[PDB]
């Protein structure tokens, strides 16, 4: 039943990120939790999903038709869903998930994070939103978001909607039912 969606890089392979993603996947799978992720075998997406599979967990991949070849659709997922549009991927992911973990990534990861955060802050769902950042990948973003908060562009209840942690033990504890 309990399902966690992990959003993470689809482009670059720094080993420390693949490590983190593989640890993440294996920890999810050990709690009898399902993995939902962008359904690609590339990069951190492949590290989290393949790890979760090899450790005994259910894996659900959600990937746009247009991105099937670029991000290597994972036909090895226990269920794979190919959405007609980019927008539908995020919708489907967010609906099947109970909680969200975001790992280091770039624009794609951030957009996925923003799409669930927004829906959260607008009060459209009651699901924990976690960022796992052991080496301050997101420092620069968070310093920015704080400025916006201080200057009245992002509300206080909106910042308190983001749980940002440095360790995998806290991310999982923040994600639990």
Ligand X SMILES: Nc1ncnc2c1ncn2[C@@H]1O[C@H](COP(=O)(O)O)[C@@H](O)[C@H]1O
* Bind-site residues: 71, 89-90, 106-112, 118
Query: Which residues of this protein are in contact with a copy of itself, per CB under 8 A?
Result: 9, 11-14, 66-67, 70, 85-88, 90-91, 104-108, 110-111, 114-115, 117-119, 121-122, 124, 139-141, 143-145, 147-148, 151-155, 158
Looking at residue 14, what DSSP letter applies? -
Q: Could you say whether residue 94 binds ligand X (CB under 6 A)? A: no
**What count of residues does the chain have?**
177
Pair 38, 93: CB distance under 8 Å = yes
Question: Cβ distance 67 to 39 under 8 Å?
Answer: no
User: Is 141 exposed, middle or buried (CB count within 10 Å of its CB: 0-12, 13-18, 19+)?
Assistant: middle
The structure tokens 């489907």 sit at: 92
Taking CB under 6 A as the criterion, the residue among 41, 53, 90, 127 binding ligand X is: 90
CA 78 to chain centre: 18
Please say which residue, 31 or 80, places its beta carbon nearer to ligand X.
80
First to last CA, the chain: 10
Q: How far is Cα 116 from Cα 101, in angstroms, rounded to an integer?
A: 11
Q: Is 46 a binder of ligand X (CB under 6 A)?
A: no
Binding residues for substrate: 71, 89-90, 106-112, 118
Q: Nearer Cβ to ligand X, position 119 or 170? A: 119
Minimum Å gap between C-beta 109 and ligand X is: 3
144 binding partner (options ligand X, a copy of itself, none; Cβ < 5 to 8 Å by kind):
a copy of itself
Among the listed residues 4, 6, 9, 48, the single contact to ligand X using CB under 6 A: 9
- x/- string (CB under 6 A) for ligand X, residues 124-153? ------------------------------
Cα–Cα–Cα angle for 38, 41, 47, nearest 5°?
90
Q: Residue from 47, 71, 98, 133 that binds ligand X (CB under 6 A)?
A: 71
Is 107 near ligand X (CB under 6 A)?
A: yes
Which residues does residue 60 pair with via DSSP β-bridges, in sequence order?
A: 36, 79
């Amino acid at each position: 039943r309990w399902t966690v969606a992990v959003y993470c890089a689809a482009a670059p392979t720094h080993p420390e990120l693949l490590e983190l993603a593989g640890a993440v996947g294996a920890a999810i799978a050990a709690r009898g939790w399902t993995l939902v992720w962008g359904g690609g075998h590339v990069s951190a997406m492949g590290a989290v999903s393949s790890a979760a599979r090899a450790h005994g967990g259910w894996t659900v991949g959600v990937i746009p038709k247009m991105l099937v070849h670029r991000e290597l659709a994972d036909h090895d997922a226990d269920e794979l869903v190919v959405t007609e549009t980019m927008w539908e991927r995020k919708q489907v992911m967010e609906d099947r998930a109970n909680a969200f973990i975001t790992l280091p990534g770039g624009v794609g990861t951030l957009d996925e994070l923003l799409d669930v955060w927004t829906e959260g802050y607008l009060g459209m769902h009651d699901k924990s939103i976690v960022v796992l950042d052991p080496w301050g990948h997101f420092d620069g973003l968070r310093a920015w978001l704080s400025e916006l908060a201080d200057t009245g562009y992002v509300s206080r209840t909106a910042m308190e909607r983001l749980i940002v942690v440095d360790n995998l033990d806290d991310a999982l504890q923040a994600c639990a039912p």
